[PDB]
């Protein structure tokens, strides 16, 4: 199944304040009005990095796994929100097809009513996470509107990623190298964007 992404999946591209100004930037972004694949789960490609989002009122989605095999051969990311912390590790993990709720190693780290949105990407050996949270009034699709995602995590871990899967009403779409024009307001938040390749008016 598929749904329309609308104007969602934009994120702060760099750690920089800009105010009351329009900045044109090329980065791996979810294209506007793209087909975001919908799930009610299987292993998925990672490609140029991933937008992921889930509609929630339950906190049943909890984590992710990433790598080439995601099993035994090489170091692979595990990420889990356990309500005490966000827990991260990169071991050569081995498990059943995917662990689920009943409701060697080289690095480690620790830190419907709503939508949780995320972006996962891997550039220059940095695995990056961005996210946002909002209340909503629609269950079956992403709500039409705008809210830029902001960074959480920036791991220098250098792992090769080509597959991922989710641990647990969720949505997946692929980032692509595209120019966007970003509207920073007077307080330096991104408040609107143009996907330049969308249509001739956007160009």
């Amino acid at each position: 199944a598929y749904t329309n992404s609308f104007t969602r999946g934009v994120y702060y591209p760099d750690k920089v304040f800009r105010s009351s100004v329009l900045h044109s930037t090329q980065d791996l972004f979810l294209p506007f009005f793209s087909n975001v694949t919908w799930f009610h789960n299987p292993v998925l490609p990672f490609n140029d990095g991933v937008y992921f989002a889930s509609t929630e009122k339950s906190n049943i989605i909890r984590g992710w796994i990433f790598g080439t095999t995601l099993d035994s051969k090489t170091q692979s990311l595990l990420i889990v929100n356990n309500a005490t912390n966000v827990v991260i590790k990169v071991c050569e993990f081995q498990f059943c097809n995917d662990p689920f709720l009943g409701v060697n190693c080289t690095f480690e780290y620790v830190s419907f009513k709503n939508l949780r949105e995320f972006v996962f990407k891997n550039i220059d050996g940095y695995f990056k996470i961005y996210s946002k949270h909002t209340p909503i009034n629609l269950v079956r699709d992403l709500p039409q509107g705008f809210s830029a995602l902001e960074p959480l995590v920036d791991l220098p871990i250098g792992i090769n990623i080509t597959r991922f899967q989710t641990l647990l009403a969720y949505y997946v779409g692929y980032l692509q190298p595209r120019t966007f024009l970003l509207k920073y307001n007077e307080n330096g938040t991104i408040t609107d964007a143009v996907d330049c390749a969308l249509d001739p008016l956007s160009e």
Binding site: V16, F17, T106, F107, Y109, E150, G188
Partner: protein, 377 residues
């Protein structure tokens, strides 16, 4: 001015002879509060280590390498390097640090050093003479062996396990006395981020988190979002920063600069001159603040005259009477209330035939350049 114009005679005018630029008074460096130091106590302060016949590996990343403290401390009896010296290594970095360590009799430890000779260097605790760092050691007769000797240990590829049973003893000579040693080589495992105090309102050279510049740092009211580090102007230019040790925002203004412009009468008339520091405020440098810049060596005057040498923003200067350069607001001309009324006319009763010269250029010197002969001769 004579040098700027490549001439010993200078005509009346204003000449941009130099560009003034306020110098950075000092250098500032800022990085976050020190954290995540590498746990070297497991090598330097531990009572034992792996046998010289079977050496053990170590590694670190996402951490601060306290190598300057490791070199300065008395906890090591000696050290030596296959790479750069510890004064450079205290500011070195790698994507991760890699290492190995062992315990033995002190001469058996020496037999496993980078570029050493013995069964340890051959295979049991190996290390190349070209290794990308340094090795260090200390005595261990109080912990690495009993009063009966280290007879439970072993003695002798790189940084890993040519071998036999151990024989170190605390009552023996300095080669047989127990000791512990290690070696290492080379972004995530860097040396510490040495940092200064912060200076506002002076022109300063600065570093914040590895961006650099020169400017006047000032307290500011720009509301950066919690993840944002730097602020930018409309045309890419950095114009604010977050201080990494106390998360307030500093607005950055350029250190004051402008064209030094020498106002002179002709060198026929005088050797006295006045200097306009264009756009500069006199606090940053007789003295007179014009809207065009700080003007030095001219008298401000409350009369007004035709413009002789133009300064800008309505100001002109001239050499005048007992003589000096004066600077004044230019006179646009004498005022005249025309005697208008609904029934008054003025009619000329006489004339002057006036002959006024007008001069127009019409042609340049006709040049031709043989560009093959100019370029290649």
């Amino acid at each position: 001015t004579k040098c700027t114009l490549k001439s010993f005679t200078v005509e009346k005018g204003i000449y941009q002879t130099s560009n003034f630029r306020v110098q950075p008074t000092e250098s500032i460096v800022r990085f976050p509060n020190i954290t995540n130091l590498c746990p070297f106590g497991e090598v330097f302060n531990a009572t034992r280590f792996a046998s010289v016949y079977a050496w053990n590996r170590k590694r670190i990343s996402n951490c601060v390498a306290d190598y300057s403290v490791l070199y300065n401390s008395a906890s090591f009896s000696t050290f030596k390097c296959y790479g750069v010296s510890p004064t450079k290594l205290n500011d070195l970095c790698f994507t991760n640090v890699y290492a190995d360590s062992f315990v033995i009799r002190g001469d058996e430890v020496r037999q496993i050093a980078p570029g050493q000779t013995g069964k340890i260097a051959d295979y049991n605790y190996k290390l190349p003479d070209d290794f990308t760092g340094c090795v260090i050691a200390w005595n261990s007769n109080n912990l690495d062996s009993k009063v009966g000797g280290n007879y439970n240990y072993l003695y002798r590829k790189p940084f890993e396990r040519p071998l036999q049973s151990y024989g170190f003893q605390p009552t023996n000579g300095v080669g047989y006395q127990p000791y512990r040693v290690v070696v290492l080589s080379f972004a995530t495992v860097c040396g510490p981020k040495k940092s200064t105090n912060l200076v506002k309102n002076k022109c300063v050279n600065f570093n914040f988190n590895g961006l650099t510049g020169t400017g006047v740092l000032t307290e500011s009211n720009k509301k950066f979002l919690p993840f944002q580090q730097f602020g930018r102007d409309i045309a890419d230019t950095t114009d604010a920063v977050r201080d990494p040790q106390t998360l307030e925002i500093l607005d950055i203004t350029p250190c004051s600069f402008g064209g030094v412009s020498v106002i002179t009468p002709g060198t026929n008339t005088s050797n006295q001159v006045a200097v306009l520091y264009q756009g500069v405020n006199c606090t940053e440098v007789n003295v007179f603040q014009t809207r065009a810049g700080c003007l030095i060596g001219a008298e401000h005057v409350n009369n007004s005259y035709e413009c002789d040498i133009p300064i800008g923003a309505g100001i002109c200067a001239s050499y005048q009477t007992s003589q000096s350069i004066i600077a004044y607001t230019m006179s646009l001309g004498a005022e005249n209330s025309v005697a208008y009324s609904n029934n008054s006319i003025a009619i000329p009763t006489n004339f002057t035939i006036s002959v006024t010269t007008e001069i127009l250029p019409v042609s340049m010197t006709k040049t031709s350049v043989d560009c093959t002969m100019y370029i290649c001769g």
